[PDB]
Every structure is written in C-alpha cells, then in structure tokens.
Amino acid sequence: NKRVKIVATLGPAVEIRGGKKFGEDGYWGEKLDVEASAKNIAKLIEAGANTFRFNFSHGDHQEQGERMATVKLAEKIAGKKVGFLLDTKGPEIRTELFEGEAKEYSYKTGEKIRVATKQGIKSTREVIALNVAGALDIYDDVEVGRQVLVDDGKLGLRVVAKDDATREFEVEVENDGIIAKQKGVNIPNTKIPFPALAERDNDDIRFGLEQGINFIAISFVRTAKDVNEVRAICEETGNGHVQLFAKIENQQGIDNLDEIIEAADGIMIARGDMGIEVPFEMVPVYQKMIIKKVNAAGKVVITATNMLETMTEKPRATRSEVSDVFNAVIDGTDATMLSGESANGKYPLESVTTMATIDKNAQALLNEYGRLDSDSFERNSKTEVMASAVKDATSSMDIKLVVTLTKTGHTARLISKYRPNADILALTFDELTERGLMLNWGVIPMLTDAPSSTDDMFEIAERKAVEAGLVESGDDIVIVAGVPVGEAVRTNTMRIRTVR
Amino acid sequence: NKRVKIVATLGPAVEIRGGKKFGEDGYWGEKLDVEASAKNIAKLIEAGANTFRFNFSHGDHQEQGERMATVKLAEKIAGKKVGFLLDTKGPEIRTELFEGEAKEYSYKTGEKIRVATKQGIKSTREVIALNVAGALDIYDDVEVGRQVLVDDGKLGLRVVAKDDATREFEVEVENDGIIAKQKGVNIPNTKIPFPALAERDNDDIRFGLEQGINFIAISFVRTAKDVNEVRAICEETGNGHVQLFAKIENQQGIDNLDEIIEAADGIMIARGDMGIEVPFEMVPVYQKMIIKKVNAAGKVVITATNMLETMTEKPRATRSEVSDVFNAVIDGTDATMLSGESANGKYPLESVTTMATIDKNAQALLNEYGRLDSDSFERNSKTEVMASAVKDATSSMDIKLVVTLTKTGHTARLISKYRPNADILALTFDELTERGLMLNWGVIPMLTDAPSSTDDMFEIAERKAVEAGLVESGDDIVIVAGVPVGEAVRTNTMRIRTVR
Amino acid sequence: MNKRVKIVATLGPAVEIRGGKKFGEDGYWGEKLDVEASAKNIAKLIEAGANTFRFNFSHGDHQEQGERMATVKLAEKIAGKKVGFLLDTKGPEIRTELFEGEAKEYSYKTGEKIRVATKQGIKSTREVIALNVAGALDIYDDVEVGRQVLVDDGKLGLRVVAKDDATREFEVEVENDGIIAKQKGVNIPNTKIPFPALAERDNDDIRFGLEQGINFIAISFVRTAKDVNEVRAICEETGNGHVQLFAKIENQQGIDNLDEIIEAADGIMIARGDMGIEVPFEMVPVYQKMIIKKVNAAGKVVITATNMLETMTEKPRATRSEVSDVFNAVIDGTDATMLSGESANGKYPLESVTTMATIDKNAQALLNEYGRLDSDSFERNSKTEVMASAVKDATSSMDIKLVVTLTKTGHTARLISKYRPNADILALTFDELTERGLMLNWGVIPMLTDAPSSTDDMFEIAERKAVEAGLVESGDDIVIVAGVPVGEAVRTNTMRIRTVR
Amino acid sequence: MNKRVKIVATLGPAVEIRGGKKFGEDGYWGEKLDVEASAKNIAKLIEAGANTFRFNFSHGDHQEQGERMATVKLAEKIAGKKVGFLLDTKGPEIRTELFEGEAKEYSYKTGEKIRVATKQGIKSTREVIALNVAGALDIYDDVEVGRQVLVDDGKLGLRVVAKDDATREFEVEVENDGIIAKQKGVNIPNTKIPFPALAERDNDDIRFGLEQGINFIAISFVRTAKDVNEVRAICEETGNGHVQLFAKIENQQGIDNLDEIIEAADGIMIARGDMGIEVPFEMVPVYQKMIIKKVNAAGKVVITATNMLETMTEKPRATRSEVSDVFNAVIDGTDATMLSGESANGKYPLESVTTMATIDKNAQALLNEYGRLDSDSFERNSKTEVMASAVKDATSSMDIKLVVTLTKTGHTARLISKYRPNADILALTFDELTERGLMLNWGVIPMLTDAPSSTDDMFEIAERKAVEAGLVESGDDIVIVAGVPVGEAVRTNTMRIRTVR
Ligand SMILES: O=P(O)(O)OC[C@H]1O[C@](O)(COP(=O)(O)O)[C@@H](O)[C@@H]1O
Ligand SMILES: O=C([O-])C(=O)[O-]
Ligand SMILES: O=C([O-])C(=O)[O-]
Ligand SMILES: O=C([O-])C(=O)[O-]
Ligand SMILES: O=C([O-])C(=O)[O-]
Ligand SMILES: [Mg+2]
Ligand SMILES: [Mg+2]
C-alpha cells in the first residue's frame, strides 16, 4: 500500500469535451462531457491520487465548480473518496493578452522590447502588459538592471531603462522563447507591497468553501498574517474543519517559516516560484529543512513542481525526475505533487502511476536511508506517548496494520508523524475528518458508525481491517482507542491482536 | 521505592535465645525465643530484605526448620511477605573438629604441619582433617605444590609432600590465622569428581521443599546436569513453581555458563569461592558479563559475598564496599546479597539499611551510567513486544508506576527485564507467584482476587495501586493485562491512566 | 570556496565554431572548424570548473574525435589549467545507423508503421531504420513479436508487431511522438543478444584514443570483470598502464556482477540513461546510492551521469527536479557529476557547467549535516590509509584550510579523498599523467612540482605551492603529509600541522 | 603487558627494618633504622609497580619523613628505576594527640564514658583524648551536645553527651567497639570550625618537603581554589614551580567548589576516607565517577584513594568488594590507584602493590568494552591537542605497540595520556623533574634521554630508546611525535608512523 500521498492537479488533460480529447479541433468550443471526464478522473484515483488540486490561477468560478462536480461523480465511479484542495492565485503577476491574432512571439538575445505597468490593457510584440494582483502599479517598485522572468523563468528580460512618459520598462531579451496569457512573471528582489489577502482570493476561497473543499493551499505565504486572514474566513463560514497549507515560495516565507508552520496545518514546498525568488541552488537545502520542521510539528508537508515534468510530453520520466520523487520520500515528505503533468499533458494517468511506483519503491528504503528521526521528538501529550509506543511495537515485531478509532483525526496525525513501519487505518465517524486525513503519510481513512458504549471497538477494528482487504488470518495488528467510549478523554489504550 | 532486591542470609545474629543476644554466655545452651527473634527478622523485612537465604552448610534440619518458622511469624509481624531461598552445601570441603578443648590454632609462615584425607576422623594442631562431600577420598586428586586454602583463602597451606602410609598431605603454612569447623576449604586446579548431585543435598532440598521455599541456590553448578537434577526433584514433589539459581563459583561453571543459564531460572554470582577457584582479578569481568547475559535471557541475577564485609564488626562499611554495592546496581544486578553481615555479625539490621540506602541511590543513576541496554534485545514474543512498549511509555513521559495483572508472573518478568523508569506493581492471584517474583528488579508483588469476566481490571489496577500507597491523584500509570479475562491468550493490552 | 565535487563535461559541436558559425546556424556543417575560436569556448568551460572532458566514440569518426582532443589541448594552454581526457567506448550496444542523403533525423507520430532492418553495413531511410549492432551480429532470431525497441535513452518506443522473414525486417508501430536520429542508443529489453567479449570497433577506438593521449576510459555496458580486464590488457600492452578504467553500469548483468566489476575497475560511471531502461526506472535511485557507497568504500572514483541538467540543453535555467538530482548526488557521496547533451549538443554549454558548479559547491557545504558516506565504518587496511584517517581526524578537530600531500603516484591523495576531509586536498605530484589522473577524485586539486631532493624541505615547498596557488594566506592552518625522508621512506609516513607565515 | 594505571603507595614503618627487626616484632621501636635493608624492601615495591611514594605528614616528624625520603632515593638506585615523591599535607583538620607514656593507642567498648579535651598543646590519656586542631583553634564553642566525634575514617564513633565549662572538655560515649590511636583523623560532621587559610604547620611541612625534593603535593581538605593557590605561591617562591598540586576533595565545600579547584590544581585525589564521613557515604561513588570524568576532560591527573585493598593490611588476599573497587576505578577512567595502610602499616606491603598491579593490568584490557571516559566528546583546544587526537585515531586504526613523544615539559605526553590511546606512551624527556613529574599520568612511561641537536634524527632516537627499553621488537609499528625541527618548532607539530627494523 502506498504511504506517500499524491496531490494531482486537474485540468483539461483528463476532460473529454463533446467527444473530443484535450488539444483537438474546436475542443475549447465543445462543452464538457461530465460522465466520460469523470471515468478518466476515476482512473487517476485508482492509480493512487489521494487529493485533487484545483488551481484558481486558471479558470473562472464556473470551470472550477464543474470540474469539482466531475470529481464528486469520479469518487462514485471509483468507489473511493479523495481530498479537494484549492490553490489560490495569490500576490502574483501574469501576461494578459496580445493585440490581433497573436498568442505568443519569437524573441532573440540582445533584442530590446517593452513591458507595461499600466493595468488592464493589451500586449503587443514590442509592449508586454503585466496583469498584476489587484491591479497594483509596480512601476515605482522595479529598478533598472532587475530581471523580469516569464513562464517560470523559461524567458528572461533585463530592465535596461524606464520610460516615465508611459510607465514602461525597456527590456533586452536574454534568451529565446514563449510569452503567454496568465503565464507567471517573477521579478525577484522586489518589495511590491501586495495585500495580506487580495479580494479575488477572498472571493475564490468563499466560492471553493461553498462547493465543499478540505484543503486550501495559500500561494506566496509571507507571514502568519496571510494564514490567519484565511483561517478567519474558514471559521466565519462554519468551515473550521478546512486545513491551510502555506505555500513557501519566497525569501520572506523562508524567513518567517517557524511562525507560518505554527499558524498553518501544513506547508506546500512550491519549488516553481521558490527557485526563481531565491537562489535555485538553495531550494534543496530549504526542502529538507522544511520537511524536517513540519514533521516535527505533527503537520503535513507536500513537495511540489517539476517532479515528473518531462511526462508532460513523454511516456517515461528522466532519470533526474525519478531521482527527485525518490529523494522527496527519503527526505520524509507526506505527499508528492503533479501540476502540468496531470492537469495539462498527454500522459496524466501514466504520470500518476509513475509517481505511485516511485513513491512505493522509496517507502521500502526509509528504514535504511530515511532522514526523519522520531527518537529525537519530545512526547508532549499522552496521545503522543501512545503514538511513540505504537512506533515501538511496529519496530519490535512485524505489524501488518495500525488501526486508530479517531473522532477528529488527532491520533492518526500523531501516529503518522512517528512514521511507523505499518499502514495506518484511521476509523473515523464523519466524511470531513475522513477526507481531511488523506494527505497524512501512511493514513488510510475509512468512514464507520460512531461506536456505542456497548460496542467492542477491537472487534470493529479487526472486522473493518478484514473488510477493506488490508489483513488476513494470522496477521498481527496494533489497535488504539479511547476506552471506554464517552468516558475516555483521549486515545488511552493499545491492543496487539492476531486477526481471527 | 527500592528496585534492587536484597537477599539477607539469616543466622544466630538476629535470634534471641532464652533472653540472650548472639555471642553471650551459654547462648548456644539456651533455646530459641521465637516471638522476639521474629520481631528482629520483621525489622530486616521493613528495612528492605525481600528474601531470606537459609544456608544448609551450617545447621541440622531442625535449626533450618525452626528459623524458617520464625520468618513465617516475622512476615505476620511486619505485614509483608518475603521469598524463602535455600542454599545447598554442594560439592565442597570443610574442617571437622579438633581433639581436646581446641576450637582453633595459631600458625606461622614456613611452619610444616599435616592435612588428612581419611574421612570421618578428628583434627589435631599438626593434623587438620578434611570433611569432604559424601566422604570422598581426595588423596589421589591433589599433587605436591598445590594450595589448600581455609576460611575463604584467609589461610593458605602449600602441599610440600604426600605420606602414602597415612594418606596425609605435608603442608607449610603460608601466612598467619584461623582453622575452624565447617570452614570452607578450596583446592583450586583440582579435578575431584564430586557427584552431579550428592545425597545430603537431595535430602536438604526435600526437607526445604516440605517446609515451603520459593528458591533454591545450587552451590558449585558445573553443568546444566547439576540444575536438571534439582529440577527433577522439584517437578516430582509437585513444587514445579520453585526457581533454581545456579551458583557459578568455578571455571567449569564459567565454561558452561550459556547452558547453565538456559536450564536455570537465574544465576547467583558466588564471588567468595569464584575468586579462589579462578584468578581473583577476573571476577569483575565475569560479574559484568554474567549480569548482561542473565538480563538478556529475562532471568534473575544476584550479586553475592563481601558486599558490606566490614559491617560484620563495624557500624559503617568501607569505601570499597559502598563502591562494590553501587557498581553491582550499575552493572544491572536484580539483587544484592548479605551473608555473614546479616547472619553472623553485630549489625545485621544496619547492614540491610546500609545496602538499601546504597541500592536506592545507585538506581537514580542507571539512566546516566547503567550498563544494560534493552534497545539491543530481540523482542521474541507478543508479551515481550508489550514489555518494550511499556519501557517506551516510561521513557516518553513521567510514569509513577507500571501495573501488570499476571497469572504466572511472565509479564512482570519481561517488564523487569526491560528495566523501565518506574516501579512494577505485579497483581497476581496466588502466594506462590507473589513470593516467586520477589527477586525481580523493580517488581512489587501483591496478592489480589483472580478477576471475573465482568470486572474492570484497569479500575482494580488503580485501586490496588492507591491502597498500597504507590500513587495519588494526578499520577500517570501504565497498566497491562490480558483482555478480556478468559478469552485473552496473553498480556495484549496497555492503558495509560491518570489516577482519579 | 573551491569546488570539491568534480565535473565531467561531454564535448561535441555545441562549443565548436565552424567558419565563424555557432552551433545550429545555417551551413554550420558546410564550414571548416575554427580551432582557435573553438579552443577559446572550451577554455571557458575549464574556467567554469569542468575537470575532465568526455569524448563519446558512439558519435562521429576518429578524425572528429582527434581534432576535438587537439582543440582541448589548445584550450588548456589558453586557460592555463589542465583537465582530464576521458574516452567513452561504444560497448556491446545497438545504435541507429546513419541515414541516406545524410539526413540527421526524422520525427514520427504515435501509430505510424515503419520497419527496423537487421542487415548490417547499410544506412537507414525514414521508413527502414538500420542498426549498427556491436560485433555486426544478426539480431533477427533474437527479437520476438511484442518486444519494445527503444531509441535514445527510451525517448521513443517502437512496438514489434510483425517480422518479415523475406527481408529479416521488424515491422514496428511508433508508441509515442518523437525523433529517430543517427547514432542513437537502441535498447530491446528482455532479449539476450550474444555480444562479443570485446568488439573490434572498441579495440580500434581505445587504441586510437590511447595514441591521442587519454587519462580515463569509461567502458560502456560492463557485464562482468572480463569486460574491464580486456580493456586493461590493451592499456598495459601499449605502455598506457596509467590510464584509469571506469566501468559503466547500465544493465542487470552489470548490477549482478557489481562487486567483481568494482574490484577490477578504477571507478564506476552510473550510466543512468541505459540503466533506467534495462532495469526498473524506480530501482535506479536505489542502485545509485548503493554504488556510490561501495565505490567510495573501495577507495575508487564514482561519476553520476545523465539527465542531471537535461532542460538546460534548450533553456538557460534547470527544472527543480534537475537541481535536486545534482544536489542529492553530491549528498549521496559522488566524486563527480556529468553533463552529456547539456555540454555536447545544447544552446547553453558554458551556463550548464556554471550551474552544475554552483549546485555542487552549495551541496558540499551540507555534507556535514546530510552526507550519506561514513568513513568511521571503514577498515584502515594499510599504513597510508591509517594516515588518511588521521588527516580526517585533524580536519575534524580544528579549522584546517587545506591538506597537502606530496604524492608520487597519487595513492595518498586517493586515500585522503576517500575519507572526505573537511578541507581541499592539494596533491603535489611530479608528472602530468599522475596530475591529470587525479582530476576526478573528490576534493583533489592536482598540481605539478619538481620531485624534491633528499636535502629539500618538503613542508616549506608544500606551504609555498599552497600560497602561490592562492589557496591559503598567513595565519591559515594546513595539514601536510609526505614520505620522509625522500629515498628512504617506503610510503607516506609523516603528518605535519603547520601555520602559514 | 605494561601497567598503564599508576600506583601511589604510602610508605611507613611496614617496609622499614630496625636493627634487623621487621614491623611489629618486639623492641622494633627500640632499634635504629637499617637504611640499606629498608631501601631494599622499598626497591621491591618499585619493581612490583609503585610509580610514586606518598609521605603523609599527618604521621611522624620532619626527621622520620626526611630519613624515609632518603631511604627511597637509595631504593631507586638499587631498583635502577625512578619513582615520584608525593607529600600529603595535614590541612585544616583535627587529629588525636600523642598519648602520655608514649602509648600508641587504647581499645574502648560500646557505652564506655570518656572525655575529649579542647585545650591545645597537651597529650591524651586513655580517659581524656586531646586534639591537635589545625591553627591551634579552641573548638569548645563550635561543638554542641548531640554531635558525633568520629576517629580514623569513621571507624570509631563518640557521642557528645555533655560539656564541662570548667575544663572545656566534651563528655562522650563510645558508640561502637574500637581503637583511639595517636595522630588519627577526627571528623565532627555538621560543625563549622573556622580553620585558617593556610596553617603555619602546613607552611613548614611543605617548605621542609620542597627542601628534600618532591614532585607532587596532595593538599588535604581543599575547600576552595585559594587553598590550592596558597600552596602554589610557596612552590613558585622557592623555585619549585615544577611541583604538581593534587587537591584532596574530602568535604562538602570541596565538592561545592570542584570546578574552580580543578582549574587551580594539576589534579585531584579522591580522598574517599574523609569524603565518606563528611558527605553521605552512598554519594561517594557518584562524586568519584563525576570527578574522574571532569579531571580527565581538563587534561589533569586523578588518583582514587583509600580502602582499595583494606583487608590486605592483615591478610594476604583482598575481599571480592576490594578487587571490584580497584577494577571499577580503572573502568571509571582513574589515572592512578592508591595504597594507604596496606603499604604503610600492614603485614603485606609488597603483596598489596603486586595485587593492585595485577587488578589494574587486567582492568586496562577491558577499557575498550566498558571504559566510561569518552575522548570523542572533547574540544581539541590547541594544536598539540589536535595531534593528541590524531595519535588516538592512529592507535584505533591499526595495532600500535607504542606511542613515543619527545617532550621538553611533558605537555604532549599529558595531552596524549588524556585521550587514553590503545598503546603505552614512551615519554622521552631531557630532565629528571619532567621525568618524575609524568609518573602518575595514565599510560606514560617516562624516560630520560639527551636533548636532541638540530642535526639529530629524533625518529631514529625514538625507535632506539624504545628497543633498548625492551618495549618493541622488529616488525612492531609505533607512532612518534616531536616538534620538528628542534629550535624552529613552537610545539609538537609532527607525527610519524614507523615500523621497528
Ligand atoms: O507472549 P508469550 O511470551 O508467548 O507468552 C504467552 C504465555 O504467557 C502467559 O500469557 C502468562 O503471562 P502472565 O503469567 O503474565 O499472565 C501464558 O498464558 C501464555 O501462554
Ligand atoms: O506555485 C506553485 O505551485 C509553484 O511555484 O511550485
Ligand atoms: O557460596 C557462596 O555464597 C560464595 O562463595 O560467595
Ligand atoms: O551511457 C550513459 O552515460 C548512460 O546511459 O547514462
Ligand atoms: O585523606 C585521605 O586520603 C582520605 O581521607 O581518603
Ligand atoms: Mg549508456
Ligand atoms: Mg583524608
């Protein structure tokens, strides 16, 4: 069973529209064929995607809502639930549209063209327009000799001058390639004072909150305030169950990492922007340190971006991509992510299968090479003392499965944190807790009836483990619970049981 | 609470006879005053003696039986039970009696006198007679240039010749001192073929077995056969509950240590004879190795002899004696022993108090200096997996007490083996199991009613812990049990509970 | 900060100026090689931290290889820095043939139906791809219907759907969009092609490279120790016993025989391209970490190769997965990282070396916190190795700027580099072959000096050479090792802790 | 097998022949000292492995101490082996006075009622025990009814049951059977007697010992660093700056001030006799293990003292608890073990040294499995210490028979001994004071050689001296350290691994 969780970004790549697969003739012209689209998504779920990411940097509310509805059907086709993660636009910058029939342009090194700060206009081959977050004027934030990078740094522009008359940057193209709509723009070493939380994000979140989501990934978290602002909307709408993963993708994020970890439910290591906003060679340092610190706090860490990039276009990943996924698992990540690979490319299913195969192989080598060390943790509560004793039992003998009966998931989270040498079946009593545990390392969430004071929870643990196919006659399992139901304050009991 | 157990050898020193304390006028003339004697022994028990040793090398069956009866009353005065250990005479050699009014003689270096092998005779100042085990003739086992040592090596005799006409050794006294009745005699490097089990021992054991004992310490164990021979008598008389501690006190013992450990319930490190029979400087090597190997086998190790020797005559031990007791605890001994100190000297109570004080102080330093390492053990059974998880819980947080509900003591023994940072209250259901656990490190045995299938054993654990004074409101305890009673095959459950 | 992790850069047309024309400008191939301008490009890769150039004999002919090696010799004079020369053999491999009309390549679409010829000694057309099989073997009876023929490190899959006995051709379906170029690696998993012990082509390539002057041979598709021994025999026979053999592990037989291969070789190149097609792709990170640990424990060189900065063939910045792979290869314990297409065939060869150098330099500073190699586990099996252990201890006890070894053959420098001290290793040696021969050992800065006389102060020399190299300044503490005295010492026998004046 | 753990033996009458009479034969005291025959006895204790003799100034007068030191100087010439000379001061202590009629002692029974005088300058009778109080202090107002007066390391307890203001005498009850002898330690726990900073008696004893020629002073009852500094000032003032100070820790103030005492001293003597009465007896093993670890971490000497083989005062074999205590002191990390009554006052002084030597030699072979000291934890705070660490590493990497240090002051030998290498340390030094001054450092075999000239081969000398000492034979590997070259080197800067010819 795959212990490392997969976040798969959804998009047009899986969506059959009017009988036409993605990238064909008048595709964006046809309307979405829900049942067929849903069968594709079901196939991602069966292949090991544990959560779908809906990126609010691409698509009106209508595209998102319909995609979100397609997954709901997909869960019913697959007969398996997934988490629903919403990724915010956040304080970012993109490339608007081009005048005439143009979608892009060919540029050459030493070529001198223009970038506009004038918000809400159009792009010309000699005048690229910047769509900024909340239409801010960045003209007085950017100095000559700064770099404007387009399509995740795929194309660089050197600010060689500034025209006060038009509020335009004069830029010399540094290398050859593509300029595109809603295509990221980084201007590193730039103190643009974006809001603690833009309105468009406020709006996107409430929309997502009303559709039903489990997780919010908050782009460009700079300070705890950015997390707390989103917490506020979550508690206010009565969605206090929603978990916030701070996306660390700049120096301010890294500088305030400790305070961001405390306010958040987890960290998405957003290496795309991080490797432009900070020295690319420091990203692997920050990755390892962030995984260690988030695991130490009992929270969720997702490693993101370029993990199987090549499988956008090809059926097999490069040796560096297989290495990167493998090493994320060894570093101790709870989850690995696909973006364009699953959302936008020709092999989304294959991307998920491939990531699953790598993650499953790497998990077999965590004993030998794993970087996380649970022996170093302070056990700060009686539930955590029990998670430690569970890890000990799984080290002392061959344990097929750990079962926790968990009201809110707290026990499953502390067991996960300790990385036992076993899968963790988390028996919970509502769908929100079940979906909320789907990014925790090793945790297999399962809905069951809330136990009565006359029920045998150890018999329920065994029978639900047998039903789910996770154990058979003669297997040894560790079950934890709060006994007796409705007298116990917390998980207080551990039972070693041989399956009948 | 004292975790290191004390074996106190009983003898005349505590026994008021006819109103006369030990060593006074016509003392051995008066007859034993049981109730007063029993009040003295009760005082040893309250001071921390956990088991009384009855040494069958001194005293007819009548002396032993009456002493054993005095302890039974002592337990009732003290309101605390102790174990009853019988120490066999074994394949040894002693010094008979002297012709005329003599009890001893003064000798000088270079002096040439005689030793007799002729069994069952009398001693003269020029002719010391050897009382041998089962009256064997050792004349053809001992070569010229061998050493005959008397009173635990306190006095040495060099065999300078052999007189065939009388079967006597001609010996030159090596140093000045005491020759005495039933006073040990070692002849190291001597292959005397004593029986696998002498008749006198066979008889002593059956006598002890009929009085009611928990433990047999078998002097001069050479091979597993010596243990198995005693096992046979124990099973045959329906006393299969009795535990056998092999006394390792010669090279053959050390050579077959692994096979002796397997057949035995434990090892008494009998340093008195061991330090004459093997190089004295090797005894501390063998002590540490034997403690490690016996702990690894889940069995009991007692360290014996000269531990507080000086307190035979003085109210305060030497700095080397305090060091020796302290270091036995750090090495990982389950128990420390007094012989002459409690049996024969002027300060038996003070000897017990002193050993208790040292043992209690040393226990506080086992985390820092302790030699035993439970992390290195293979967990070879599900009860042992649980003993490991208990040790983990006691390492992760402050645990006042571990409670085991144990039918035969097996769970208490495996918890003890792991040396948790807590006292171990062992709730058992018969006196034989209760007394049988009294030499296991950290174990506080307590008799209670066998639980019914409708009882709450976690409530019974808490209430018996509160009754015994070991815990109060707010303390955290770890309780293990086989649940449910009469369905569980073994200890299968661990509960962390805060006392009400 | 000196870069301790070594870089192998593959050379090809990408650095080469032809008639004033840069790589992939029109008529480029029309023009003659501008040697001086090409040597000037190559000098920049030496300055950016390429320690050894790779000459892949799977591509081009003797004339192109020989001219390229001569251009590098000029580049060393322009840079004032020497580099190693590494020859990469074809091995028991399959490559695509040249095409008729010297077309370089063709694009194919999923579902396209084409043929693969088995007849040796012919050229490909777009519709009939011909194979150069090592030993000129006929593979027709070795490949069944249903086998996959993969082209260029598995970039393009071809499914065998039928066999024509008349022409001994395979009828194949293109499984994915991509390119068949000339001289591209061809894999056919789960076949047993009886390749010869040593191909005649390999015998000739190695002998031609030995003639030009090389320091290293990377032997492709090492299956057993006999593949290493066959090349060793040629190096010894031609009086090139100083040439080091790196076995390329890139199939299951190589993995199966790793122990005897490491014993017979001077090092291992982890050839991940072929390895990740010949074995399960997800096993390659397991084999990588394990090979680095075993080769370092044997006191030998390990090179991690292929796809390390792949995206930089076309773009000026690498992907996050690529920077991760380079950084993790350093943490794993690699002596060296390698560039293939990035430096041979790409738009950014200089920037590829500069980027790798930057990642390698950053990763070395985290070896204390994260490094996998554990020198405390090693048996010190000789007195030089005991001294290597003591040097490591001295660099752990205090801030040592530099270790200096006066080394005749490089043995002391290899044993110090094995222990991965927390310092640069200045290897003072007395001949250029030993000097170039150390350029892929972790942390080693090889430098030529005069063999010291029995009346020289080797400790004074060590300090002066270090100061002249700009490695140390007054107040720096250095550790120096030497066999003292010269002419009496059997080995490195002396360690001196010295403060620079 | 060389004994690495050092032995201090206290000398007294037990080795001394008087008019052909051995110790405790009649009229023994009647006769004059047979110097040659006494020196011959003492030579046997040197041969059995006593590295330093202790001269306890609490017992006897200057004349007896001076004669005894002269007898030892003769013993060294007879044995052909040098030993250290250690003076033990009285300190701020109480001792029983001499008795009238020069009776040596009296026996008392539990319940016997006697008196203790506070008036200074008088002799004891059996019924009125007089005290020699350091500083000739009047202690009458310092001791309340209910205090315990303990005699001879707590062997005999006296309960104070009343006070007679007329005579300023204590009325006391004997609590247990035993002996009050002349010049015996007296403890009175939970009193605060204002002893002087340095007693005039101590000033005179130290100055008399410095005149005879000593290497070490063990300062009794060190309370603070000022007690060490007061003695240091006298050693420096008299031109005896080479004399080493071992602070005796034997009360709670000493334990409280341990850090500043270790800083000020050259070493610690763990004086367990007084310590185990002035603090809870059951704390002494805790303080012992902790003092050994702190003194070894400071690069200094620790001596474990008192009751180590107590039973061998009267008997030829020690108890099992006594052999355990010696063995465990070695495992704890002690540089040295000590004999008091066993060697000074007993029937078996030679056998006591032989027995300790045997236990010490056996225990050193188990330091690898059980040793408490951990040199991996230490900061290497100087370049000599870095070299000491590297020597240890070399003795862990391979079988080293011997470490040889050419040491002017012994500093390199102390730093090597601190790291407890798995080898004997041959310290080649150029003066007898340095030589005797190293005789209590763990593992150090001090040996006098000629200061080497700037043209000598110090590595050839090291090997020859080692071979002449019979420590090594051809084929043995040795590690040698030196400051090279002589006259230029600021410190030990060179390590050589060398195979004996
Ligand atoms: O778990 P293990 O070591 O196999 O032991 C199982 C045995 O121990 C017992 O559980 C006894 O344990 P207790 O005496 O502590 O109750 C037996 O019933 C059982 O057969
Ligand atoms: O935002 C992201 O997902 C990134 O930059 O990786
Ligand atoms: O037999 C004993 O008890 C001994 O020798 O210690
Ligand atoms: O040959 C190579 O370098 C490979 O396959 O990676
Ligand atoms: O003074 C001493 O040596 C002691 O008290 O142990
Ligand atoms: Mg290859
Ligand atoms: Mg003292």
Automatic annotation (TrEMBL), chains A, B:
Transmembrane segments: none annotated. The keyword Transmembrane does not apply. The keyword Zinc-finger does not apply. UDP binds at R53, N55, H58, R67, R94, K183. One of its GO terms (cellular component) is cytoplasm. ADP binds at R53, N55, H58, E63, R67, R94, K183. Signal peptide: none annotated. GDP binds at R53, N55, H58, Q64, R67, R94, K183. Phosphoenolpyruvate binds at R53, K247, G272, D273, T305. It catalyses: pyruvate + ATP = phosphoenolpyruvate + ADP + H(+). This is Pyruvate kinase. It comes from Streptococcus pneumoniae (strain ATCC BAA-255 / R6). The gene is pykF.
